[PDB]
Amino acid sequence: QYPIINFTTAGATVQSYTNFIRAVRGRLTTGADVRHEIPVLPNRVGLPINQRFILVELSNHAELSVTLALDVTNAYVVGYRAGNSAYFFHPDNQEDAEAITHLFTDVQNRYTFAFGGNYDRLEQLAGNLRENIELGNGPLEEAISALYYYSTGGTQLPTLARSFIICIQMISEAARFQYIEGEMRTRIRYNRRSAPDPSVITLENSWGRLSTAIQESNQGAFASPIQLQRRNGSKFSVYDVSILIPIIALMVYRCAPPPS
């Protein structure tokens, strides 16, 4: 059975959220693969199906619960269960399609969305870009309700798409980036909902590239600089793993580390 991590928005605090994200990271990877002080997610190649997923059960003040399924290789939300229905994003390949047949096997009604779960698609469906979708404990509380009521016709697709966008950033992106975890902690601390600024958005967009640049680096030095953005939207270059150590918490596996 896949590991389950519980979080509730009901009376959520900085500490309870911090505990949650730490637990997610702990279940996503062993931490045995660390490169320049940054842990790496397990290699997809040869990973047994019995170790492929973790479950995040989200509860809210409305006394509703949903369970998200996360792929350990990339922290992607691949689908969710609410009551006796489960929904999965359109799989990218045959391996992923087979993999999701091992999730929520006890549930009565299982569906595959005809759309994928990437931001590009979800933003199109939501009718809003990430830059205009508010994040925080309130948005998450509401997202849990929206996911819960989808199967019974209580949630329009743009609201569902928006709700996924909220969950993905507050769970998966926070797990990937200490910086994004910090941004969410701030929102929770002051109970103030706000859309993510360019520093958050550019990190999310660059996670794959940053992971590769770090893993392919010459002793930490990037061959090609990566452009990120500050909070005010101004651009700066990253040349080295060093400045990313306090920013990135998990990388996607790209290759084996070079000889030590």
Resolution of the experimental structure, in angstroms: 1.6
CA distances from 258 to 54, 112, 223 (A): 29, 39, 16
Positive/negative CA dihedral, 119, 73, 215, 232: positive
- The vertex-37 CA angle with 230 and 232, nearest 5°, equals 5
User: Any known ligand binding at 140?
Assistant: yes
Q: Is the dihedral of CA 172, 178, 179, 184 positive or negative?
A: positive
- Contact partners, residue 32, CB within 8 Å, separation at least 6: none
Report how far residue 140's alpha carbon sits from residue 249's, in angstroms, rounded to the nearest whole number.
22
Listed in sequence order, the residues at least 6 apart from 7 whose beta carbon sits closer than 8 Å to its beta carbon are 16, 17, 20, 56, 57, 58, 59
- Experimental method of this PDB entry: X-ray
The verdict on whether residue 193 carries a ligand-binding annotation is yes
Look at residues 161, 170, 56, 69 and name the one whose alpha carbon lies nearest to residue 115. 161
- In sequence order, what E strands does the chain have? 4-8, 34-35, 38-39, 53-59, 65-71, 77-82, 85-88, 109-112, 221-229, 235-240
Residue 4 marked as a ligand binder? yes
119 belongs to the catalytic site: yes
Q: Classify burial at 16, counting beta carbons within 10 Å of its beta carbon; exposed 0-12, middle 13-18, buried 19 or more.
A: middle
Residue 97 near residue 161, CB atoms below 8 Å: no
**Rounded Cα distance, 104 and 125, in Å:** 25
Query: Cβ distance 206 to 228 under 8 Å?
Result: yes
Q: What's the token pair of residue 64?
A: 């509703």
Residue 27 assigned ligand-binding role: no
Are β-strands 53-59 and 4-8 bridged in parallel, bridged antiparallel, or unpaired? parallel
- What are the residues whose beta carbons fall under 8 Å from the beta carbon of 233, sequence distance 6 or more? 197, 198
Contact yes or no for 75/52 (Cβ under 8 A): no
Strand, helix or coil for residue 149: coil
- Tokens 């045995």 appear where? 32
Active site residue 76: yes
Is 191 known to sit in a ligand binding site? yes
65 in helix, strand or coil? strand
Structure tokens at 106: 């006890």
Annotated catalytic residue: which of 17, 76, 80, 148? Answer: 76
Selected catalytic residue, list 27, 123, 148, 173: 173
Neighbours of 156 (CB within 10 A): 11
Q: Is position 148 annotated as part of the catalytic site?
A: no
Tokens of 102: 């091992």
Give the residue from 107, 39, 97, 31 showing the smallest Cα distance to 67: 107
Cβ–Cβ < 8 Å for 76, 62: no
List beta partners, residue 226.
Answer: 238
The amino acid occupying position 113 is F
| Catalytic residue from among 2, 119, 149, 239 | 119
| H or E element in which residue 168 lies | none
State the Cα–Cα distance between residues 173 and 247, nearest whole angstrom: 11
Task: Give the span between the Cα atoms of 108 and 85, in whole angstroms.
Answer: 6
Closest C-alpha to 204, from 247, 246, 256? 247
At which residue do the structure tokens 């689908």 appear? 79
| Separation of alpha carbons 129 and 112, rounded Å | 24
Which are the contacts of 197, defined by CB distance < 8 A and separation ≥ 6? 231, 233
Residue of 27, 52, 162, 176 with catalytic role: 176
- 3-class SS of residue 8: strand
| Contact call for residues 144 and 59 (beta carbons, < 8 A) | yes
Judge whether 171 and 56 are in contact, CB under 8 Å: yes
The CATH class, in words, for 4-190 is alpha beta
The annotation status of 144 as a binding-site residue, yes or no, is no
Give 209-228 as a DSSP string: HHHHHHHHSBTTEEEEEEEE
